[PDB]
A paper describes a structure:
A third vital component of the TFP biogenesis system is the assembly ATPase (PilF in T. thermophilus). The TFP assembly ATPases are part of the extensive AAA+ superfamily which form molecular motors, using the energy from ATP hydrolysis to drive mechanical transformations. The domain structure of T2SS and TFP biogenesis ATPases is similar, in that they comprise one or more N1 or GSPII domains at the N-terminus, followed by a C-terminal (CTD) and N2 domain- which comprise the ATP binding site.
Estimation of the resolution of the TtPilF map (AMPPNP-bound form) by FSC correlation gave a value of 8 Å at the conservative value of 0.5. To construct a molecular model for the TtPilF hexamer, we examined the fitting of the TtPilFc crystal structure into the AMPPNP cryoelectron density map. The fit of the docked model was optimized by refinement in ROSETTA27, giving the model TtPilFAMPPNP. The results were indicative of 12 separate domains in the lower half of the PilF hexamer i.e. two domains per TtPilF chain. Calculations of centers of mass for each domain showed that the TtPilFAMPPNP N1 domains from both ring 1 and ring 2 are displaced downwards by distances of 4–9 Å. This is accompanied by rotation outwards (mean value 14o for ring 2 domains), which leads to a wider aperture at the base of the structure. Binding of AMPPNP is accompanied by an outward expansion of the CTD and N2 domains which is linked to a downward and outwards displacement of N1 domains on binding of AMPPNP.
Author numbering:
A (entry chain A), B (entry chain F), C (entry chain D): 505 to 888
The structure:
């Protein structure tokens, strides 16, 4: 009874709450049910400990798992739908000394991916961003922390450029999104489709745009670079604290600087900071020391403002609803390319880049705090 | 019975005075019982030879081990109590030509998990420990050999962050702490549920917090870090005698250096020394050879104070009263992150960190001796 | 499965437009088939998504792949020699969220068998080509994806050296490069005539020249090696992406390292770079660091004049007009044979040959970029 109601009730709300994840997680006497909302788990409900196993068996069914294989941890995919609700789930079940556990991660659709316009870049760098991502060929990187939008930006760009005339071709594991116009290839070690193999397949597929879900394999750093040189547009993902580091990372991973230089068109770093919920938005003031570090001066600081939430139903009482992306844009030109071929470091490139207009990740963040998206605190609190 | 009371009482003293282990050994009238309090097998008491069977039968009957079996070894788990103590032990016995031997290991209960404030950090390093482990995301490494205090540090941090409202998924083999609010997977080869398989599921299962009791499987090291890279807060336990080299060790475990860089919030190397009993502390010379080897300053020698234990009864007659943890904390800012992605060694990472003010394991320990808590020599014995 | 209707209409159009590739794109509700011409795609037709699965399934049959196997993707060459439409296709059923994408890359026809002077060899690789092919003993291996002219050149070797004084016999799958006056055999796996089996007979013929159309089978790697080992010129297509890697590749395929070195005399990799159409030969004088990092002799980096096609209504506006061959023949001597047994990296064994006069593909292609034939980017794209 309760077990069947339970699985579907949590899943239904997870989509409605836009939880990124659904948890059915057993404890000593009961099961704590939690939804990952705006990047963090919070309680939803509880199951009786007995209901737990009935519940886990039900989700194994929901994801297509082998219901009989209760010794080994398993996973699969739930095409969970309810009325207008439609988000695939990645279901994973696991034994616990407290009974079986199950979690259903929300996977996404083309309709969840923001337009390139919805990504959150400062307008200055955004127009330059669009100019870089619109290039007929060349390396464009999107790098950084969880939820940063490395994936969403990558796909916002890929969808934009996945026009009738372009083989937008990607590497995902499993496919994260359901998107038309783009060949969303899934990594499959049984087939030999490792990330490096999947990019070898990318070139064999005669592509227009590469998407490397994460450039982990050294070979993917090189293949993505080759792709750029071969006349493909290259979009690839890393985890860096800045754009100059991401270029540096292409060299740290073994990509020759003469290719990075010829191929590179721009590097983007990106991260998430909480967004103030509109239903409770209120004007507050910023910390002037941070603002002085931005170069704002007393002259502009005197009129500076930040926003926070007062709390509302939309934000779950936290004052914030969703998180927004912050962007660093290393638009690449001749001086940067001369620095790259020479083998220059992230610091050396960064100095050129800022002189050339590279609004920094931190700066775009603090800027968005100042433009009313967030607070000059959350920005600082989500980096290293 | 005398044996049952003996066992409950020795266990109480062992936990109360901080033994790592309880040693009950074969002797021809009488049985020698020692407690490894503060690392030394301090004498505790004795029993008639026939007590080897009565007392060990208690160790086994409680452990869940077969009493009659005296040829093959056994290893169990018991929640034991007397006086101020109610704490878990591992229970094991050894087949012996002279009659069995039994030793019980001082596991702590979930309810005994210390606040991070209770881990022995001086206020300075403490605030940094707190700031590191409380980072909204990333991996914290806890390192060292038998006698380092890893499980308390490991679980202390967990106590602070894995509230009942947060999803947590822990790997143990077998379970030591249990711990409502946190899902605890016990590794089970019957299934094929390795630490790696346990984490394979944890990753797909999206907990906020991941804990691994021992990073032994390569895949386990990688996954725990993978989550930590972008947003999960991860606690990992492993063997290393240097906070910066620990980074190198995680690289050795198969975790991509770039993954480590992004994930890592800090590394703590630990060691425990004997605390001097207050009621018989002896202010010492201090010894010039011991001091020379350690490098103590006249500022310390002529004003800070080192003590030895003389004997105060309350110390088991050995002059000491419990372990004093010594802590070497590497705080991972983004310069150290750079060093990591750059492939830098402990020397390079440590030198950057010391240039930033990082206190070494010997500097901390010696301070602790100089705080009048421990002995100059106890510190020396576990460092250079 | 029709599916196949489109597969056939598409293939016919792809050849007529000289598309480099066919893209049967699995989509959300349908399948979008696109052709690649001069750096961009154009749509041809669509199929129902259900037809996609039928496409994937039938193309698997076509490639000799298992139609019943869709737990994983498959790939292979399809002998679609449909009269006027007779370019061989590289089938890659790469799995996406919408099913596998049936890419079919176009592999070239005999295209007349050239003299070695018609291949565009630099004097370095040219004279060495002449030297290597003139031999009575040893394997002359050629690399790059079919369509890059491997077999074009492989058969050029025979055209030039299979004189009335020499016993020549070749085996292919299917015969791709016919040469009048030369005895050609086609494999027949149905009979059991693997390449190895044929080559085994070739050993038995005490031939002067033994051709292998594609050294792909493990048995064949061993026998093709024996083909030369036993005292015969062997000429072969080694279907990999690098001449130097081709050496190591025989070892990768299970060929005794020793037999491989005994068996080899020269390995050529070749590619074609897109041309700059004269009009837009803009002398983008090089950054010497690019050229130096490319391993271009200092003498050459100084004489170097890099180009970039402007794009340029006569290209256009890609910056390029058609393709131009570049070459790297690793003439083999004893330094190379040491390296062959060793299984050295492509770069090092190639560099050894480079100093023998083998303008590496990077030196040669770059030299051609440096003359305005092609551009930096194309060279890097083809030579990294």
């Amino acid at each position: 009874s309760a077990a069947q109601k339970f699985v579907k009730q949590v899943i239904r709300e997870a989509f409605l709450q836009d939880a990124s994840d659904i948890h059915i997680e057993p404890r000593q006497n009961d099961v704590q049910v939690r939804l990952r909302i705006d990047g963090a788990l919070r309680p939803y409900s509880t199951l009786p400990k007995g209901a737990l196993n009935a519940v886990i068996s039900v989700v194994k069914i929901m994801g297509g798992l082998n219901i009989a294989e209760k010794r080994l941890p398993q996973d699969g995919r739930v095409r969970y739908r309810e009325g207008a609700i439609d988000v695939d789930l990645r279901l994973s079940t696991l034994p616990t000394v407290y009974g079986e556990k199950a979690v259903m991660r929300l996977l996404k659709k083309a309709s969840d991916i923001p337009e390139i316009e919805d990504l959150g870049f400062a307008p200055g760098v955004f127009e330059r961003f669009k100019e870089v991502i619109s290039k007929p060929y060349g390396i464009f990187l999107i790098t950084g922390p969880t939820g940063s939008g490395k994936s969403f930006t990558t796909f916002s760009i890929l969808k934009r450029i996945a026009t009738p005339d372009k083989n937008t071709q990607t590497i995902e594991d499993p496919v994260e999104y359901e998107i038309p116009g783009i060949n969303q290839t899934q990594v499959n070690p049984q087939a030999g489709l490792t990330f490096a193999r999947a990019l070898r397949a990318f070139l064999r597929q005669d592509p227009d745009i590469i998407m490397v879900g994460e450039i982990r394999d050294s070979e993917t750093a090189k293949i993505a670079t080759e792709a750029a040189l071969t006349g493909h547009l290259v979009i690839a993902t890393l985890h860096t604290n800045d754009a100059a580091q991401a270029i540096t990372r292409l060299d740290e991973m073994g990509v020759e600087p003469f290719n990075i230089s010829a191929a590179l068109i721009g590097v983007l770093s990106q991260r998430l900071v909480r967004r103030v919920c509109e239903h409770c938005k209120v004007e507050v003031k910023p910390d002037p020391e941070t603002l002085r570090r931005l170069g704002l001066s007393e002259a502009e600081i005197q009129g500076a403002r930040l926003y926070k939430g007062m709390g509302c139903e939309r934000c779950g009482g936290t004052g914030y609803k969703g998180r927004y992306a912050i962007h660093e844009l290393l638009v690449v030109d001749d001086e940067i390319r001369h620095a790259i071929v020479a083998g220059k470091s992230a610091t050396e490139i960064k100095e050129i880049a800022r002189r050339k207009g590279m609004k920094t990740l931190r700066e775009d963040g603090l800027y968005k705090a100042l433009q009313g998206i967030t607070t000059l605190e959350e920005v600082l609190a989500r980096t290293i």
